C-alpha cells in the first residue's frame, strides 16, 4: 500500500502573522523600476530584512554554490555570496524546478515560504502605484510562490501527480489546460488518470476549487469622454458555479492561502496602469467600479486584466478601443 499522505494539501498551517517593515519598503523602492524584469524582482525579494531570520550554517555556501549550477537565474555577480540574500534567492528557484533538497534545506525552505506573500503583495503594491505595467510580472511571480512552479512550466504541472509520464500522455491527445482534463470524455481521461484512489483523491481536489471566470465590462458614458476628469468603469466577473469556499489547493505551499484576484486597466503601448483593485470572487456573479483619469485627446487601446494570485492559468482579459474628446 503505502498512501503518500499530504495534510497541507487543503489544509494549511497558519503563517505567522507580520506587517512588512517600512525599511523594507525603502528598500524595494529603491531596487525596483519600470524596468525590472523576473529575475529583478525576484533578487529584490531575497534583500528583505526579513529573511535575517532564516540560519546560515557552516559549509551551506559551498552547498549553494553547487546548487547555483542548475538553476536559471544568476545572482548578481558583483554581490556577495556570504549573504542569506544567495540562500533565500537560490532555494525559491530549487522550490519553483522542484529540485530534491538536503533535510536541512527543506526546513529553511519552509521559513522562507512563511514569509514571501506579504512581501510579493509589497511588490505588486509599489509598481501598481507609480503606474508601471511591469506590476504584472510581479503578479506572475506571486502565482509560482503559491503553486511551487514556474510562470513558463505546463500548466497541468500544478495538479497533484501529475509527472511526465502523465504530462505526454496528454500531450498525445492535445490537452493542454485543466479545462479541457474536465471537457473529455470518460474512457479518455481514465486513460490519463492512471492513478490510484488515494492520487485521485488529490487531483480531485485541485480540480474542485480551480477557478474558471467569466469577463465583461461596462464604461459609463463612452460616447463623451473629456480628458483629465474622474471616469469610472464597472467591471462584472461569474462563475459558471458558486464556489464552495476560496481555500487554495497547493501541494507545495504548506500555509493556509485564500484566493484573490487583482483587477487591472492599463494601456499596453505606453506600458501604463491605470487602475488596480484586489477583489474575491466569493460569489457566482459581481461587479466592481474602477475610476481613473481620462486619457489625452485621441485613440486608445485599453485592456482589463483578471489576474488570479494563487492558480496558474486561469487568467482573464479584454481590449477595447476609447475616443477621447
Known amino acids: 500500500e ?7 494539501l487543503s489544509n494549511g498551517l497558519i503563517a505567522s502573522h507580520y506587517g512588512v517593515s517600512f525599511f523594507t519598503i525603502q528598500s524595494f523602492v ?3 523600476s519600470n ?5 529583478n524582482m525576484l533578487y529584490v525579494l531575497s534583500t528583505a530584512v526579513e529573511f535575517e531570520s532564516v540560519p546560515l550554517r557552516k559549509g551551506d555556501r559551498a552547498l549553494l554554490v553547487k546548487l547555483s549550477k542548475r538553476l536559471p537565474l544568476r545572482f548578481p555577480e558583483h554581490t556577495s555570496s556570504g549573504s542569506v540574500s544567495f540562500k533565500v534567492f537560490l532555494l525559491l528557484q530549487a522550490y519553483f524546478s522542484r529540485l530534491e533538497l538536503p533535510v536541512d534545506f527543506q526546513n529553511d525552505l519552509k521559513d522562507i ?3 514571501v506573500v506579504p512581501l510579493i503583495n509589497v511588490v505588486v503594491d509599489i509598481l501598481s502605484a507609480n ?14 510562490l503559491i503553486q511551487g512552479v514556474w510562470d513558463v512550466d505546463n500548466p497541468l504541472r500544478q495538479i497533484p501527480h501529475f509527472n511526465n509520464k502523465i504530462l505526454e500522455k496528454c500531450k498525445e491527445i492535445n490537452v493542454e489546460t485543466v479545462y479541457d482534463i474536465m471537457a473529455l470524455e470518460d474512457e479518455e481521461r481514465d486513460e490519463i488518470l492512471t492513478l490510484t484512489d488515494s492520487q485521485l483523491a488529490q487531483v480531485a481536489a485541485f480540480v474542485n476549487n480551480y477557478p474558471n471566470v467569466e469577463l465583461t465590462y461596462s464604461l459609463n458614458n463612452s460616447d463623451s469622454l473629456i480628458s483629465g476628469v474622474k471616469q469610472k468603469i464597472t467591471i462584472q466577473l461569474t462563475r459558471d458555479v458558486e464556489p464552495e469556499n476560496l ?3 497547493s501541494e507545495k505551499y504548506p500555509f493556509d492561502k485564500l484566493e484573490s484576484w487583482w483587477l487591472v486597466l492599463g494601456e499596453v503601448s505606453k506600458k501604463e496602469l491605470y487602475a488596480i483593485k484586489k477583489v474575491t470572487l466569493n460569489k457566482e456573479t459581481q461587479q466592481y467600479e474602477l475610476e481613473f483619469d481620462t486619457p489625452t485627446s485621441g485613440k486608445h487601446n485599453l485592456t482589463i486584466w483578471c489576474v ?3 492558480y496558474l492559468d486561469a487568467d482573464k482579459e479584454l481590449s477595447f478601443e476609447i ?3
Open 131 to 144: 503606474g508601471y505595467l511591469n506590476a504584472t510580472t510581479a503578479m506572475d511571480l506571486a502565482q509560482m
Open 30 to 32: 529603491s531596487s525596483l
Open 308 to 310: 488570479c494570485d494563487s
Open 323 to 325: 475616443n477621447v474628446k
Open 113 to 115: 515560504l512563511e514569509k
Open 2 to 8: 503505502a498512501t503518500e499522505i499530504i495534510s497541507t
Open 35 to 39: 524596468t525590472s524584469t523576473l529575475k
Open 247 to 249: 481555500q487554495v489547493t
